[PDB]
Write a protein that binds this ligand. Structure first.
Ligand SMILES: [Mg+2]
Ligand SMILES: [Mg+2]
Lengths: 225, 113, 56, 48, 48, 93, 225
């Protein structure tokens, strides 16, 4: 069977369809599933790891003039999507200064070089008149799910560790169709669908997933006995 | 895995040669596990269409989707041409490998249930 | 102190329980199989892992 | 302390079905819909 | 579909959205162990 | 199950005699620091440690493995208790 | 990141082998085990009997006078025959067997063919009696996987009986994933891959081909559109 044609259909930086056809019978699951498992587990990304709020000692407190408590603010921060434009950048600290009455969004963070916020309309807190929100948010780069009890990252004394879900891939689904070529009708059409938060394009996630699988297949090369 | 499938598509058709019985199956008149009579004996299309030399071939066909674990086929196990499903053959191998004695494990199991 | 326990203690604990068994007991101990001896396997968590076959 | 769900914690529904969490699987290990949506909880049909 | 193998479950599965509660009984509050410790006054047996 | 448990049970007339022999042999091995073992170096039980394989510290495992070999003589009124100890002290100080 | 796992092999003969890869990241035992199992059972090239012609035989369900084994059992024995083509250019061969009773027909009774090796020459084909004739012509083809006789339907001449072609040299694959630890990491996976083969290819060779097939397919995600 000749080399399959690879077709890429992308809708922005969040969705992408990747079609590989024609494949031999049963290679849709053979190729799709390892990529899906690697995409959903082993794709590096950036997530909020630690947060420090002025005049806040722990996450079980409320800030005067702020409708949301620190628990809800941290929950809103866990949905923040931060994209590092520099591959060598490993950690950034985002500075937020806001005074009520306003609805402080993710776009209110002070700009940082080589850092882009992919969801500027994310709502963080609702400030009441006379309320202030001065906070530093630490965004690290990693892979997997690291609970706040494991990393325990605190830039300073009153920093609050935040459970970090680094994986940028939101959802992966792959589809196997009944394509035919010539006189044989048992062939497979594999279509990989990847949903991401936008920091890593689905094509980038697919390329990283292929490399990880390819890199692991090289582990079968030196047979110790 | 050890329960067999029962079909109702054919369920009674009689023929003259096995090839006639198989020929009806590709036409869709009789199902795989439908009880039929080939010449005088009562069998099914599965026991005629699929005869496996050993359990390894039988379970290889299952992996390729040719047959299911609940489909009754003909398998040559321990020198005896059995007429059982791959799942029952699979259960026989489960006991044989666990006890590491094919002969004794064969005497310990009730295959036909 | 929990924060004073180093990572070599867990390696030593594995050596300590090697070969040894513990008794698992569930009340009411209606018959003698209510107490059985198992070889402990150190796991992360706080729940005892029970083999399915000994449940009955 | 902010307690997350862990193995050994007891869950239940309004219909009397109760049990402790015995395994926490990664998202890529749970059974998923054809559209790629994984399930959150797996219940044994034998309790019905 | 199966997240490990990628192959579907051989039969259709009842999948849906159900309301599950996290009960007050947690393994964190129930795990307990003891080698030596307090003993009773009269019987000198361990406390409970 | 314990290795060779079926063979161990068939070597005694009562299963509780097997436990007594294993436990008494385990104490003899512990008391003399496993220097009275009947096990050859290829037969000594080993445990997998981070540094490497080492001798199994569980004497009950040693006692069960020694007894399968058949080099241990067990029974009632074999030797005097005081005579048995003093002789074992001299051979294995 | 995690250290490169160690690949250990434990092969007994040319028909069975156990391969262990550890330590692996959590979930990568399944990620690497299932695709290899699928490729091993459906993609490793091999040879099989795809057609048999026996003189005086009309159908598969008949019986030859003067021989214990009926046509079905002779066909079943042919499916156990293991033959290796020594010439890569060679594609299909026919093996000629003429035997006279009351001898026991073996796989070594096949007439030798150029660059064609019978891996098991002691295989029992049929048992003849005095006055029995066994004039048999078996056709051996090259392919992959399992193909039923009704599917390929290969017949050399009239009255030829197509036979299920067990092309795959791999007889059975069973992989196991075991939890392992490396220090403070407790979620690591240890993958044990067990392969049974007919002997034409070593189980190590079969695994190497399966890895290469998986590696080759990963290169297909290279040229979009
Ligand atoms: Mg995120
Ligand atoms: Mg057939």
């Amino acid at each position: 069977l000749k080399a399959p044609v690879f077709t890429v259909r992308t809708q922005g930086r969040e969705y992408g369809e990747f079609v590989l056809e024609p494949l031999e019978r049963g290679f849709g699951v053979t190729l799709g599933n390892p990529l899906r498992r690697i995409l959903l587990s082993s794709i590096p990304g950036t997530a909020v790891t630690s947060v420090y709020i002025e005049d806040v000692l722990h996450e079980f407190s409320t800030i005067p003039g702020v409708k949301e408590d620190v628990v809800e603010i941290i929950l809103n921060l866990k949905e923040l999507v931060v994209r590092f434009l520099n591959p060598s950048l490993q950690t950034v600290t985002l500075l937020l200064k806001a005074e009520g009455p306003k609805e402080v969004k993710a776009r209110d963070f002070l700009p940082v070089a080589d850092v882009e916020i992919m969801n500027p309309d994310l709502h963080i807190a609702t400030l009441e008149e006379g309320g202030r929100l001065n906070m530093e948010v630490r965004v690290d780069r990693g892979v997997g799910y690291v609970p706040a009890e494991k990393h325990g990252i605190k830039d300073r004394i009153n920093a609050i560790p935040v459970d970090a879900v680094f994986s940028p891939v939101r959802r992966v689904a792959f589809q196997v169709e009944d394509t035919r070529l010539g006189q044989r009708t048992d062939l497979d059409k594999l279509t990989l669908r990847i949903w991401t938060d936008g920091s890593v394009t689905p094509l980038e996630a697919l390329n990283q997933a292929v490399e990880i699988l390819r890199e692991h297949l090289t582990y079968f090369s030196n047979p110790q006995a | 895995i050890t329960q067999v499938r029962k079909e109702k598509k054919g369920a009674g058709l009689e023929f003259a040669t096995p090839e006639e019985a198989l020929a009806a199956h590709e036409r869709g008149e009789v199902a795989l596990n439908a009880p039929i009579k080939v010449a005088g004996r009562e069998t099914s299309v599965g026991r005629l269409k699929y005869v496996f030399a050993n359990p390894d071939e039988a379970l290889l066909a299952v992996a390729h989707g040719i047959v299911d674990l609940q489909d009754v086929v003909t398998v040559r196990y321990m020198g005896k041409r059995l007429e059982t499903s791959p799942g029952r053959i699979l259960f026989a191998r489960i006991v044989a490998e666990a006890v590491e004695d094919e002969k004794v494990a064969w005497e310990l199991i009730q295959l036909d249930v | 102190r929990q924060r004073d326990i180093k990572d070599e203690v867990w390696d030593a604990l594995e050596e300590v329980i090697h070969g040894k068994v513990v008794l698992l007991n569930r009340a009411p101990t209606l018959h003698r199989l209510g107490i059985q001896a198992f070889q402990p396997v150190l796991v992360e968590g706080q729940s005892i892992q029970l083999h399915p076959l000994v449940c009955e | 302390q902010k307690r997350k769900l862990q193995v050994g914690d007891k869950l239940a529904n309004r219909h009397g079905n109760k049990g402790v969490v015995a395994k926490i699987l990664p998202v890529e290990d749970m059974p998923h819909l054809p559209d790629g949506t994984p399930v959150d909880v797996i219940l044994n049909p034998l309790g019905v | 579909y199966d997240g490990r193998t990628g192959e579907p479950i051989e039969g259709p599965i009842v999948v849906g959205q159900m309301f599950i509660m996290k009960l007050y009984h947690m393994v964190e509050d129930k795990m307990h162990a003891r080698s030596t410790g307090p003993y009773s006054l009269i019987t000198q047996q361990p406390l409970g | 199950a314990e290795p060779g448990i079926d063979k161990l049970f068939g070597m005694v007339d009562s299963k509780y005699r097997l436990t007594v022999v294993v436990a008494k042999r385990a104490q003899q091995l512990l008391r003399h620091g496993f220097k009275n073992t009947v096990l050859e170096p290829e037969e000594r039980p080993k445990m997998q440690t981070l540094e490497g394989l080492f001798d199994d510290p569980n004497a009950v495992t040693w006692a069960m493995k020694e007894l399968l070999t058949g080099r241990l003589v067990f029974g009632e009124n074999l030797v005097p208790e005081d005579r048995l100890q003093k002789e074992m002290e001299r051979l294995y100080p």
